[PDB]
Structure formats: C-alpha cells, structure tokens
Amino acid sequence: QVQLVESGGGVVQPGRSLRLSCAASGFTFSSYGMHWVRQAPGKGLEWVAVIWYDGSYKSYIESVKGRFTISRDNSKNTLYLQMNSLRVEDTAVYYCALGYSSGQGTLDNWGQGTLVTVSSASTKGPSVFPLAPSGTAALGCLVKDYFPEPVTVSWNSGALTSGVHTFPAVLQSSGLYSLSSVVTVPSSSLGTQTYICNVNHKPSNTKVDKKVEP
Amino acid sequence: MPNDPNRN
Amino acid sequence: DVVMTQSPLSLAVTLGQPASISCRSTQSLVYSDGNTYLNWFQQRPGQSPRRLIYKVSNRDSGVPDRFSGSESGTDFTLKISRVEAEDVGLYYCMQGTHWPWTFGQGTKVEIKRTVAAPSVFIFPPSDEQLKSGTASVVCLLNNFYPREAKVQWKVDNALQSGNSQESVTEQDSKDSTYSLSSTLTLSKADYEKHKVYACEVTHQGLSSPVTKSFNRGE
Numbered sequence: 001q002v003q004l005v006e007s008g009g010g011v012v013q014p015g016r017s018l019r020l021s022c023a024a025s026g027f028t029f030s031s032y033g034m035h036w037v038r039q040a041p042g043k044g045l046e047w048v049a050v051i052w053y054d055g056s057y058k059s060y061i062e063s064v065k066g067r068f069t070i071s072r073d074n075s076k077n078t079l080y081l082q083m084n085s086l087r088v089e090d091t092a093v094y095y096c097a098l099g100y101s102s103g104q105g106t107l108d109n110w111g112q113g114t115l116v117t118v119s120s121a122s123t124k125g126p127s128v129f130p131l132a133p134s135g136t137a138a139l140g141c142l143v144k145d146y147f148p149e150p151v152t153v154s155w156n157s158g159a160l161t162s163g164v165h166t167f168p169a170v171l172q173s174s175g176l177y178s179l180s181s182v183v184t185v186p187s188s189s190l191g192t193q194t195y196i197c198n199v200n201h202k203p204s205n206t207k208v209d210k211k212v213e214p
Numbered sequence: 215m216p217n218d219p220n221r222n
Numbered sequence: 223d224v225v226m227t228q229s230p231l232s233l234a235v236t237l238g239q240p241a242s243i244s245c246r247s248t249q250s251l252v253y254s255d256g257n258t259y260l261n262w263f264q265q266r267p268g269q270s271p272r273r274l275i276y277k278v279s280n281r282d283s284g285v286p287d288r289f290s291g292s293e294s295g296t297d298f299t300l301k302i303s304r305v306e307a308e309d310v311g312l313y314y315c316m317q318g319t320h321w322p323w324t325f326g327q328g329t330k331v332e333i334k335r336t337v338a339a340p341s342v343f344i345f346p347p348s349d350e351q352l353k354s355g356t357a358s359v360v361c362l363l364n365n366f367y368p369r370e371a372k373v374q375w376k377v378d379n380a381l382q383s384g385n386s387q388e389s390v391t392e393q394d395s396k397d398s399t400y401s402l403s404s405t406l407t408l409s410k411a412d413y414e415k416h417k418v419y420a421c422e423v424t425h426q427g428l429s430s431p432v433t434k435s436f437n438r439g440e
Contacts, residue, residue: 059322104277129351130350217318217321
C-alpha cells in the first residue's frame with residue numbers, strides 16, 4: 001500500500017541540529033507533494049512545511065523559517081527535514097503526510113511519526129521491578145527512572161494482552177520517567193502459570209524480561 | 215501558490 | 223495565518239447520544255475553484271490521524287455513516303449522530319485553502335457510561351528494588367467510571383502527604399472505563415521502620431471507602 005516511515009528522531013541538545021528522513025513506497029513518489037506535521041506531547045497537531053512534487057515550491061510556518069529546511073530526493077523516494085537551532089518548543093512527534101487520491105487542500109496518508117526530544121539530559125535506561133500479587137488477582141512490573149520516552153511493555157512475549165493496562169509515563173521530580181504495567185488474571189493461575197513482562201527502551205538499547213511471581 | 219502540491 | 227478555533231475542547235456524551243464539534247475560521251476558506259477545503263481528522267492514542275471529512279461534508283470511504291459534516295457560515299460542524307464507545311479520542315479540523323495549512327486546537331471525546339466501582343489492589347516494593355535504597359508501593363484502581371477518584375495512602379495509620387504520584391489510562395475504547403495507578407515513594411530506611419501500608423480509595427461507585435493493605439514482612 002502507500003507507506004511512509006519517518007526516521008531520525010532522538011535526543012538533541014538545544015541549539016544543535018537534526019536531520020529527519022521519511023521513507024516512501026508503494027506509490028509514484030515523485031508525483032505527490034509532501035508535508036511535515038508535528039505534535040508536541042499531549043498537545044495538538046501543527047502543520048509545519050510542504051514541498052512540491054518536483055521540489056520547486058516550498059512553504060514553512062513562520063516559527064521555523066530560517067531554521068528548518070524541507071527537501072526531497074525523488075531518485076531515492078525520500079523526504080527530508082533539516083532542523084537547525086533546535087529549541088525546546090520544537091519537541092514533538094514529526095509526521096510526514098501526503099494527499100494521495102487528491103492532494104488539493106487535504107491530507108489522507110500519514111507515517112507513524114518519529115519523536116524528537118530537545119533536551120540537555122542524558123539517555124538512561126529503566127530499572128524493572130515486579131509487582132507481586134497477594135476471584136481475580138493482579139500483578140505487574142514497575143518500569144522506573146528512564147529517559148527519554150518511550151518504553152514498550154508486552155506480557156509473555158505478547159501472548160497475554162487481555163486485561164493489560166500500561167500506564168502513561170509520569171515525569172518524576174528527578175526528570176526521569178516512571179510507569180507501571182499491570183494485568184488482571186484468575187487467582188487459580190498464580191501457581192500454575194508463568195508471567196513475564198518484556199520491557200524495551202530502544203533509546204538506551206535496554207531489553208529486560210522480569211518474571212513476576214507470587 | 216496553489217493549494218495542490220501534486221502533479222496535475 | 224488562518225486561525226482555526228474549535229469548541230468544545232473537551233466533550234463528554236453518553237453512549238447512543240448525539241455529539242457535535244464546531245470549528246470557526248478567521249478568514250473565508252472558499253478557494254478560487256469554489257470549494258471550501260475544511261477537513262476533519264480523528265486520532266486515537268498513539269496513532270496517526272485518520273481523515274473523516276474533506277471539503278466540509280464528504281465522508282471518507284470506510285468511515286461509518288454516523289459521521290457527517292456541515293457548514294452554517296457561522297462555523298463548520300462535525301456531527302456524530304449516535305456516539306459509540308470506539309469514538310473516544312481527539313478530533314481536529316484543518317483548513318487547506320491558505321498556506322500555511324492550519325489545524326484547530328483539538329477536541330477530546332469522552333464516553334459517559336454507567337458508574338463502575340474500581341477493583342483495588344496493593345503491591346509492596348520488591349526485594350530487588352529495596353537493595354538500592356528506595357521503595358515504591360503501588361495501588362491499582364481497575365476499570366472504573368467516572369475518572370474522578372481519591373487515593374489516600376496510610377503508613378502505620380498515618381496519612382501520607384506529598385510522596386505519591388498518579389497515572390490514569392486513556393478511556394478504554396470498548397467498556398469506556400479508566401484505570402489508575404498511585405505510586406508511593408519512600409526510602410528503604412523509612413519503609414523498614416513501619417509495618418502496615420494501606421491505600422484508601424473513595425469513589426462514587428463505592429458505598430464506603432475501600433482499604434487494601436499489607437504488613438511489611440508477610
């Protein structure tokens with residue numbers, strides 16, 4: 001199908017630079033104009049820039065003019081956003097987007113986004129600790145003291161999904177995130193059945209599997 | 215600038 | 223820039239009821255070809271936006287027909303005729319008549335269901351964590367509605383202040399409930415000087431407060 005995949009986001013110090021790329025496939029990429037839309041965490045969508053199908057015309061929000069450059073390589077099916085003089089306000093998920101069936105005044109195809117964190121803080125992987133259970137019981141894992149977002153958490157290598165709540169990360173007074181992931185299960189399973197949570201923090205290349213026992 | 219960045 | 227103003231910013235409506243989101247524009251969005259390029263997008267947590275309406279009232283293929291769009295000159299309106307549980311999320315308007323293209327601030331749609339009391343569980347710190355000097359105690363409120371809930375911590379029956387933090391899930395798109403975690407944070411030395419750890423939960427679904435507790439060392 002039509003497929004866009006953004007890459008390049010990470011931690012970047014304020015004032016430094018970062019090149020975002022978006023990889024397109026499944027359609028004739030050189031016939032469609034391309035857009036960048038960002039979304040600060042927990043805030044609203046904001047259109048940023050567009051580039052014509054052939055690269056002629058470009059257009060930017062005033063808040064990024066002079067710092068951001070949109071470009072593209074049609075021979076590589078690739079979109080680019082070059083970000084200089086990054087500010088903390090530039091922190092967001094950046095999507096690439098296009099209008100396929102029609103491109104006039106609309107958008108109908110988006111990437112999954114890449115997260116750009118403008119922060120002087122260091123990348124730090126989490127510590128994982130079990131939440132041990134006491135009709136229905138609950139158990140979980142506490143994923144603590146990491147930076148930046150995000151972590152993913154599955155249960156039993158993804159074989160266990162019913163009943164799972166992974167809580168939104170909370171920023172502690174230290175500047176590090178912490179979350180819990182829980183699941184509700186039958187009490188009778190607590191001595192029959194194994195429960196392992198699978199924590200992945202890609203920014204620090206941290207993978208941890210914790211067995212949660214009663 | 216028109217509001218369609220695609221090829222006609 | 224064209225300023226899209228949306229109202230309401232948050233909208234709570236009971237299942238089966240209608241709901242409508244409005245968007246106003248500081249400039250005409252009629253383009254030289256005679257069309258109005260007003261768009262409506264739905265976005266679910268952790269998901270790219272999905273177009274619902276383009277040019278005011280055209281519904282996207284594969285978008286259910288309880289969604290409609292219309293214009294009153296005064297403003298543009300997205301309508302959901304009968305609100306369903308899967309319609310939680312954010313909704314944005316977007317004009318693509320003038321560069322720069324602009325969105326509205328967004329509108330969050332909460333489902334109003336019947337009251338559901340939470341199930342409450344307490345979790346002591348792990349011996350692994352205690353070996354690095356700090357203790358986390360966790361209280362879980364599972365599948366409740368509405369979202370407002372009071373979680374109080376008591377240590378040896380002394381009420382705690384300032385040393386806990388709360389997180390709440392997005393409204394479940396199927397049963398329209400929430401869940402909440404409260405994390406109490408202590409030093410190991412303070413943890414070991416007390417025996418009873420309790421979280422006391424009051425909620426509109428509970429006829430009395432529910433206390434879950436453990437004794438350190440059991």
